[PDB]
Write a protein that binds this ligand. Structure first.
Ligand SMILES: *[B]([O])([O])[C]([C][C]([C])[C])[N]C(=O)[C]([C]C1=[C][C]=[C][C]=[C]1)[N]C(=O)C1=[C]N=[C][C]=N1
Ligand SMILES: *[B]([O])([O])[C]([C][C]([C])[C])[N]C(=O)[C]([C]C1=[C][C]=[C][C]=[C]1)[N]C(=O)C1=[C]N=[C][C]=N1
Ligand SMILES: *[B]([O])([O])[C]([C][C]([C])[C])[N]C(=O)[C]([C]C1=[C][C]=[C][C]=[C]1)[N]C(=O)C1=[C]N=[C][C]=N1
Ligand SMILES: *[B]([O])([O])[C]([C][C]([C])[C])[N]C(=O)[C]([C]C1=[C][C]=[C][C]=[C]1)[N]C(=O)C1=[C]N=[C][C]=N1
Ligand SMILES: [Cl-]
Ligand SMILES: [Cl-]
Ligand SMILES: [Mg+2]
Ligand SMILES: [Mg+2]
Ligand SMILES: [Mg+2]
Ligand SMILES: [Mg+2]
Ligand SMILES: [Mg+2]
Lengths: 226, 195, 212, 204, 222, 233, 196, 195, 196
């Protein structure tokens, strides 16, 4: 997994690759690793996939109830605090490694979160097996006062470095841009540089190729009248 | 314990269970009955870790007998087997699981059909024409695969069972001291006293 | 693996399966589990593929040298003992072998020796070896007689491997049959289990448990 | 020892044009010993189909659990559960056992009754959802199934063509796995008819 | 503790035709989650119209190929420039492998060429030297993905003739070199999609009576 | 079987149109202790080859002595020792690769990762890797240790395949190498600021640069970073 | 990690490097290890980043609740709350914390709390993996009642050496000055402290 | 292998050895002769690890036969037992020791006395009126301690041996498939073909 | 153990503590760790006392035989013989040795040979368990071309701190001065160096 976060002039952008793996096998080629905690707080997750998903839904659910209770839009620091205390309590067994970004009435924010519950602040961050390839790109091209267009470019280039150089990463680049005073724009499959070429042959079989023993209609309908 | 076999024929279920009880280096008993009557038309044989086997069997027996009295009705073999499976499936994630494998032979009086269920200590249930637990199947299934027919009489089932026991007595290293054979049919449960 | 061999009125029947596995992965269904040591001697293959192939091929070289030196066919006793003594030298090192050495000489008649990588060497009338050995034993023990015709003996060996192929997960593929007489062995074909099962089931009335 | 490969078995699902297919082998074993050739791994709750591979006791337990939950759902909601909603229910139910999980590989298949859209989904043993457009695989021959599906599959296959594709994917995958086979079933699912076909295959 | 073994990934595929043979392999070399090289040749022309690949631990793979090439050289010296037939090469490789039975070459070896009747031949070896002539064999990382597909599309397994419903099998008609190369390319394209250690490039060596020809194709680099 | 004691970190390298570049820092680490600050890990062999070595330093010094002896031995009874029969990069590599694999086969490895960079007699670029296991491979860019994870991704953006080599100048290649060394200094905890760099060109020969430093570093942004989440002061 | 706190004439100064490592990978090169638990009570953190963050957050909560009831807490009180958490949970924690604070009554105070959860009041303290390399230097160069400028130089020179020799230490040198005048943050970059 | 027994009576030594050979799960053979004639009036039975047993026995046989030819003379049972003990005592400190236990039954033609020697794989030798290896003694020694008299006939020895085998067949878990019995006396070695 | 060797204007000086421990027991408090392998080539020993004595005895034998054939060996040559023994027998040895010597052509030279058996020529070297605590101090205070009196003070102050912090170091500070003038032994007692 390669996931990054990059701050810019008036907000923050996060990105991620779309490959999920079970050992050396690719389980899903177009996996969605950008999760929504709230409308303008999004996070990307590496590690155990069920954990990143579950911990995001839980905190996202509680963040929503908190927002309704307080009559205020949710804050990134609240998501961060709730995530870290939950993960700390489970002493690293909940294998969620997250980059949490978002905009709120306080401003724009970017944090990372490791599975044992430790958090970090930064202008640019990367997590996952392809984080070293991505961080190499970020350390080479990052500067202060990036524009929106420059940050999207830098973030996707950092994911590409992971896609091409890390075997744990691949397929497509997903992006989410969170700008101050605007709706967060989720760009699913922002880049698609790994479409499979046409196969040499069609493997459609002639009808009646498979040997059958029995046929029967399955009753999916309920018990009928009359 | 060791060998437990089951075969479902036309009109009955036949269970065969070894008589030996071995603690280590000695054979303490050669007439042990590894079975419990759960209801008038349902029999359960069992094998596994010592103590747990009888404790589990008698616990199941008590529960089915309780149901029978409460409802004045005998549960179907299928219903009993499902109850037993759930208890074992519950047990496998306990502090100390029941290390017990069972065969349930019953005659369903409603459907007028014999029924044989094989359940292991994990709670893995399968309905079968013939079944076994442990290494018993390894020696007997090839014979059963060849000779078995769904319309066999009880006498033909016993003859096929004798062939299975003879193969076991030839190729198994352990002396299991013969088997006690019991038949479950429409008239209930009875023991074949000469085998 | 399921391999068997048995003595009878017409000589020796040798029958083996064809499956090779790496864990649950089926590596091959076309393995030659019988080795032609010469026109008179056969060896069966169980355990490690390589160990069995290498050292039974080697055994054929030693047998050839014996009969070059002694101007006479090597006995099944002598041939089996060369192999057992060899693997005994390697005992502990981790060889993995369970083999039947089968032959037919004037002085001995039809003879089978079970040879083993722990150094065991046993003469006998019936042997089954491999993961599916118990399944094959059942069919053999209940149907074996001395007064079997070459035709019936061949079928029993075929049927016993099929029994094991059905039940044992690490046995299957196809059946290779050999018949060993005093003038040499005779190959009796490769029989796909996928076709043999449905054929035997239909003709024999067996496997009523399986739907077809 | 490994709970997910004691009993063996496989499940595969595929989408086609206005249809879905889900298939499974029939084997249940105790490691090397074949025990049953009638252990079906596909179940259905209304029009939603669920295949489950892995430890057989958990396959049975989960089926009984989802029957339980989908029956209560229907009584309260006054409608049959949909594939998308059932997928979330499976995920939620598996994750609740995060640190004492069911050793299974579930596969959901079905057609949404309102939108008519074909749907398939896979899970790991603790609830992570794999929602593929093309196909889902599970079980002891999942590597083999991935290889078959990735080459044989093409999008928008008609129901009777999809049958041939999924059948050949299952059969040839199972034949390269010691713990899979002993029969096979294929469900072809359309918006208001479902056909079930038992396949003839080698019994070793 | 020092581990003398490693895993360099990769996947290879040998297919024997009626009067030809192909031995293919991807050109990616890896350790763990890193790529060492996108183009590191794995299938080699060993002389005498024999091609070879030893897939797995690359150090053992290179050592074995090197010792076999050497064995071909000395076979010529010792036996009056006689051509080493594919069956003789196969037996020779068994002894090279079994020589290290108790400290094995951690590789899956496949050789390809033509037999003495001019027909296509492929031989397959396990790490300790057991071997067998085959019509079709994949080796290495994605072998479990590729072999079932080849059972179905080369040997027509589980395929029957329409109308007969399981009674008549699909007849085993011979495949041309153009047909085999299509199946090889689709096998590696599919393996690249679902296996992380497969990609970058595909190199195919084709053997005929005319000699050894090479073909290269790009694979996905992610 | 042993364990490495005093170690050297990444060696990085790449091909360009007329030759090869290789680089490595001057640190000899003793676990987490940055013990020795003047260790040369690039060792030239003649005027056409530079061998870069990472891993155990005692084993490096042994290899250095093997190479020194190799030059001596090649000169023996060799009138063309400084001409047609001079040591080639390919000869030096194959020798080392043979030694590495032999040592691993005796279960007593030289605990190193080695990159042999050079230019052959016909002008061809030579760049190949070998390590403690005897594993060998070639690529337009090669790097050891942390360099494999961080330097390669950057260097591969310049030369992504074989056809990019003729399009890459020595200025662009050196720039990329120097940047990669800076990135490694930011991110590798067993690296140093001081490094050596060697260029082997088919026209201008061997240029060996010592006492180079990582420069143009970005640290100013650190002043704005406060706490680990909620802290404002 | 290289951290230290030094009392001087006008109060106390905390110092720290900015490196966080996962093995040999620098996971964060611009880390802030100087953390605020109260207005003029700060701490330096070493050991597990998760543990020391969890502890510091709990302490900040305790002192915030203390303040609301009893007014400004002493540095000794803050050190006691740290100790209680570190001692009672010693089996499950890996935390080495230096607590530094400024009172008007007590002036500058430094307390070190090593792994076991013991407390030690000292004129100055050093901790973290990099501290080992500067025990000699700091012992030789420390004086009581130094000026602000002298104390900044002492910490700058000390942490410079700790960074030089310890691979787990590096980046920038952060400092926080605690006096009657207020709270001042200082930062020193590699180009400055490497040439010392 | 499993059970080997020995008893020295008035004028002969009787050795009884089980017929079963078991490889793990299956009984491969039920007619195995676990003995070798070392000389016309000396017999050795053996039990231990597979392969090693026969290899050791045949190696000893070859050595005694070689001695017999060289000297044209039969070694006394005592001399043979000492040779065997030394080989095992040498073996126990080897790279891979012989895991073999033996009984040596011989008739000394010089002294006109039967002699039984028990030797384990360590090279521990004892002359006994009756002996056993493994768990066999655990059952039989109490019967032998009671019934044994040093002046028994061969027929009485066989009857006492039958009582020992009957006890083994009752209380031992393993099926050893009966025993082959051989008698060593002044006329040499012979096998009792009905037991 | 705290050992060091320092080159200066007139040659080189070796320094060492005198403590040998078996766990926490001081088995010898007056140990001589400065050992002579040739007239003006000495070494400092750390690690196993058996191993470093065995090595030093073998080296002394080699250099004695070298001298009888080829005349006085260089310090580099002595270091090479040490290295050969430490490198080739690395699996079975625990030895950290500093080799120091005086030539007239090369003057004062110092070579350090750590655990692995590598060689490093340095202006000065420190080693032993106690050296960890004085990396900062020595790096800050060392200058090239010091006088004899300055070098004695540098070593005395350095080993004083190493002894202060390291439990495995202690006793007296022994020193051996190597110059053109000859070989001088120095000793400094606790009452002297503890008050520094
Ligand atoms: B990435 O590499 O971190 C990636 C992204 C994920 C958060 C959606 N992780 C995975 O793909 C993980 C790797 C992994 C394997 C085994 C244990 C722990 C982590 N995969 C899964 O979680 C996974 C694998 N198969 C099915 C479902 N989920
Ligand atoms: B048989 O199951 O013994 C079989 C016969 C072999 C001699 C050709 N052996 C194997 O399949 C073994 C594994 C095994 C399975 C069951 C019991 C014992 C051993 N396989 C291999 O030796 C093997 C596997 N893959 C490649 C090469 N060899
Ligand atoms: B320092 O090295 O003690 C440092 C201080 C921490 C409070 C930021 N600790 C770490 O970097 C630790 C590892 C460690 C290194 C050296 C000594 C003790 C501990 N790292 C982490 O806690 C860590 C690393 N990566 C991600 C999350 N947490
Ligand atoms: B010093 O601590 O390294 C010291 C120097 C030695 C050459 C006299 N070594 C020892 O005291 C060693 C133990 C040790 C302590 C600290 C680091 C490394 C080793 N002691 C011995 O070798 C010893 C102790 N008691 C009796 C004999 N030898
Ligand atoms: Cl932190
Ligand atoms: Cl000493
Ligand atoms: Mg069961
Ligand atoms: Mg089978
Ligand atoms: Mg199968
Ligand atoms: Mg790939
Ligand atoms: Mg540092």
């Amino acid at each position: 997994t390669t996931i990054v976060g990059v701050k810019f002039n008036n907000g923050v952008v996060i990105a991620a690759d779309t490959r999920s793996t079970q050992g050396p096998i690719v389980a899903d080629k177009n996996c969605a690793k950008l999760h929504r905690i709230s409308p303008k707080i999004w996070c990307a997750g590496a590690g155990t996939a069920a954990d990143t998903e579950a911990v995001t839904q839980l905190i996202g659910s509680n963040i929503e109830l908190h927002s309704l209770y307080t009559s205020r839009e949710p804050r990134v620091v609240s998501a961060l605090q709730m995530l870290k205390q939950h993960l700390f309590k489970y002493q690293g067994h909940i294998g969620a490694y997250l980059i949490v970004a978002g905009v709120d009435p306080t401003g724009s924010h970017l944090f990372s979160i490791h599975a044992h519950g430790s958090t970090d602040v930064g202008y640019y961050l990367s997590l996952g097996s392809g984080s070293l390839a991505a961080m190499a790109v970020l350390e080479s091209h990052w500067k202060q006062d990036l524009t929106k267009e420059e940050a999207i470019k830098l973030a996707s280039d950092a994911i590409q470095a992971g896609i091409w150089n890390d075997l744990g990463s691949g397929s497509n680049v997903d992006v989410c841009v969170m700008e101050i005073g605007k709706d967060a724009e989720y760009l699913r499959n922002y880049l698609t540089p790994n479409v499979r070429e046409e196969k040499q042959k069609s493997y459609k079989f002639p009808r009646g190729t498979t040997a059958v023993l029995k046929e029967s209609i399955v009753n999916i309908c309920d018990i009928q009248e009359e | 314990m060791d060998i437990i076999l089951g075969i479902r024929v036309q009109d009955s279920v036949i269970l065969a269970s070894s008589k030996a009880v071995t603690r280590g280096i000695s054979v303490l008993k050669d007439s042990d009955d590894k079975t419990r009557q759960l209801s008038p038309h349902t029999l359960m044989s069992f094998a596994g870790e010592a103590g747990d086997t009888v404790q589990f069997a008698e616990y199941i027996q008590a529960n089915i007998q309780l149901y029978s009295i409460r409802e004045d009705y005998e549960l179907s073999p299928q219903a009993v087997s499902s109850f037993v499976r759930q208890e074992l499936a519950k047990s496998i994630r306990s502090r100390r699981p029941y290390q017990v494998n069972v065969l349930i032979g019953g005659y369903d009086k409603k459907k007028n059909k014999p029924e044989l269920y094989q359940i292991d200590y994990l709670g893995t249930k399968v309905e079968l024409p013939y079944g076994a637990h442990g290494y018993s199947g390894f020696y007997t299934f090839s014979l059963l695969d060849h000779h078995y027919r769904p319309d066999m009489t009880t006498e033909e089932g016993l003859d096929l069972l004798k062939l299975c026991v003879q193969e076991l007595e030839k190729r198994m290293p352990m002396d299991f001291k013969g088997v006690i054979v019991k038949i479950v049919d429409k008239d209930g449960i009875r023991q074949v006293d000469d085998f | 693996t399921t391999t068997l061999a048995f003595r009878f009125q017409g000589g020796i029947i040798v029958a083996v399966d064809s499956r090779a596995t790496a864990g649950n992965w089926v590596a091959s269904q076309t393995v030659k589990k019988v080795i032609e040591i010469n026109p008179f001697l056969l060896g069966t293959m169980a355990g490690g593929t390589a160990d069995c192939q290498f050292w039974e091929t080697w055994l054929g070289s030693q047998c050839r040298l014996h009969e070059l030196r002694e101007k006479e066919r090597i006995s099944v006793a002598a041939a089996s003992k060369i192999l057992s003594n060899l693997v005994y030298q390697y005992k502990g090192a981790g060889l993995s072998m369970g083999t039947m050495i089968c032959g037919y000489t004037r002085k001995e008649g039809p003879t089978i020796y079970y040879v083993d990588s722990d150094g065991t060497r046993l003469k006998g009338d019936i042997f089954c070896v491999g993961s599916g050995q118990t399944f094959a034993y059942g069919v053999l023990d209940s149907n074996y007689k001395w007064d079997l015709s070459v035709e019936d003996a061949l079928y029993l060996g075929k049927r016993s491997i099929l029994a094991a192929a059905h039940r044992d997960a690490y046995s299957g593929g196809s059946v290779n049959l050999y018949h060993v007489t005093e003038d040499g062995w005779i190959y009796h074909g490769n029989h796909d289990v996928g076709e043999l099962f449905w054929k035997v089931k239909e003709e024999e009335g067996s496997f009523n448990n399986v739907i077809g | 020892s490994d709970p997910s490969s004691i009993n063996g078995g496989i499940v595969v699902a595929m989408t086609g044009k206005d249809c879905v297919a889900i298939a499974c082998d029939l084997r249940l074993g105790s490691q090397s010993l074949g025990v049953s050739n009638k252990f079906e791994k596909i179940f259905h709750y209304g029009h939603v189909f669920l295949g489950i591979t892995g430890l057989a006791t958990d396959v049975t337990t989960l089926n009984e659990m989802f029957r339980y939950k989908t029956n209560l759902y229907k009584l309260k909601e006054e409608r049959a559960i949909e594939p998308e909603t059932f997928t979330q229910l499976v995920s939620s139910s598996l994750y609740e056992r995060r640190f004492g999980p069911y050793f299974v590989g579930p596969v959901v298949a079905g057609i949404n009754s309102k939108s008519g859209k074909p749907f398939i989904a896979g899970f790991d043993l603790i609830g992570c959802i794999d929602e593929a457009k093309d196909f889902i695989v599970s079980g002891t021959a999942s590597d083999q199934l991935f290889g078959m599906c990735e080459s044989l599959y093409e999008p928008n296959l008609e129901p009777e063509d999809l049958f041939e594709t999924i059948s050949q994917a299952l059969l040839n995958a199972a034949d390269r796995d010691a713990l899979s086979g002993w029969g096979a079933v294929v469900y072809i699912i359309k918006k208001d008819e479902v056909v079930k076909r038992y396949l003839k295959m080698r019994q070793d | 503790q020092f581990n003398p073994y490693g895993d360099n990934g990769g996947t290879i595929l040998g297919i024997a035709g009626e009067d030809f043979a192909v031995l293919a392999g991807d050109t990616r070399n890896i350790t763990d989650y890193s790529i060492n090289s996108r183009y590191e040749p794995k299938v080699f022309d060993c002389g005498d119209n024999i091609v070879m690949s030893a897939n797995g631990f690359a150090a053992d793979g290179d050592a074995l190929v090197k010792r076999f090439k050497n064995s071909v050289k000395w076979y010529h010296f010792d036996h009056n420039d006689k051509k080493l037939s594919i069956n003789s090469a196969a037996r020779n490789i068994q002894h090279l492998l079994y020589g290290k039975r108790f400290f094995p070459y951690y590789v899956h070896t496949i050789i390809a060429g033509l037999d003495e009747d001019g027909k296509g031949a492929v031989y397959s070896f396990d790490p300790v030297g057991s071997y067998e002539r085959e019509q079709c064999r994949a080796g290495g990382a994605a072998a479990s993905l590729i072999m079932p597909f080849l059972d179905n599309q080369v040997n027509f397994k589980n395929q029957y003739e329409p109308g007969t419903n399981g009674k008549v099998k699909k007849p085993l008609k011979y495949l041309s070199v153009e047909e085999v190369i299509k199946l090889v390319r689709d096998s590696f394209t599919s393996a690249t999609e679902r296996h992380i250690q497969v990609g970058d490039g595909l190199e195919i060596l084709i053997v005929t009576k005319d000699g050894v020809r090479k073909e290269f194709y790009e694979l996905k680099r992610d | 079987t042993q364990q490495p004691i005093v170690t050297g970190t990444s060696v990085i390298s790449m091909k360009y149109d007329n030759g090869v570049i290789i680089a490595a820092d001057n640190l000899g680490s003793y676990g987490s202790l940055l013990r020795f600050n003047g260790v040369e890990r690039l060792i030239p062999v003649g005027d056409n080859t530079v061998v870069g070595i990472s891993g155990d330093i005692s084993d490096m010094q042994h290899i250095e002595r093997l190479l020194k002896d190799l030059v001596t031995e090649n000169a023996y009874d060799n009138p063309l020792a400084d001409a047609e029969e001079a040591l080639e990069p390919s000869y030096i590599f194959e020798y080392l690769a043979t030694v590495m694999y032999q040592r691993r086969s005796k279960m007593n490895p030289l605990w190193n990762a080695i990159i042999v960079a050079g230019v052959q007699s016909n002008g061809d670029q030579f760049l190949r890797y070998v390590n403690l296991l005897g594993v060998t491979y070639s690529s337009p860019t090669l790097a050891t240790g942390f360099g494999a994870h961080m330097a390669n991704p950057l260097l591969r953006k310049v030369v992504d395949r074989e056809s990019d080599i003729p399009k890459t100048t020595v200025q662009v290649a050196e720039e990329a190498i120097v940047n990669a060394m800076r990135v490694l200094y930011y991110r590798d905890a067993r690296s140093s600021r001081n490094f050596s760099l060697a260029i082997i060109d088919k026209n201008t020969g061997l240029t060996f640069k010592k006492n180079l430093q990582v420069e143009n570093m970005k640290w100013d942004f650190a002043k704005d970073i406060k706490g680990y989440g909620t802290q404002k002061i | 990690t290289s951290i230290m706190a030094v009392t001087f004439k006008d109060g106390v100064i905390l110092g720290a490097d900015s490196r966080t490592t996962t093995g040999a990978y620098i996971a964060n090169r611009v880390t802030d290890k100087l953390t605020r638990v109260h207005d003029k009570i700060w701490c330096c953190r070493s050991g597990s980043a998760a543990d020391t963050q969890a502890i510091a957050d709990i302490v900040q909560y305790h002192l915030e609740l203390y303040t609301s009831q009893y007014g400004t807490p002493s540095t000794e009180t803050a050190a006691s709350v740290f100790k209680e958490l570190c001692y009672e949970n010693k089996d499950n924690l890996t935390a080495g914390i230096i607590v530094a604070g400024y009172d008007d009554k007590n002036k500058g105070e430094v307390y070190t709390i090593p792994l076991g959860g013991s407390v030690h009041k000292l004129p100055y303290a050093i901790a973290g993996s990099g501290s080992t390399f500067i025990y000699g230097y700091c012992d030789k160069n420390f004086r009581e009642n130094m000026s602000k400028e002298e104390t900044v130089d002492f910490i700058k020179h000390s942490l410079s050496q700790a960074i030089k020799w310890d691979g787990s230490s590096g980046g920038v040198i952060r400092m926080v000055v605690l006096t009657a005048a207020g709270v001042e943050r200082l930062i020193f970059y590699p180009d400055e402290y490497e040439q010392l």
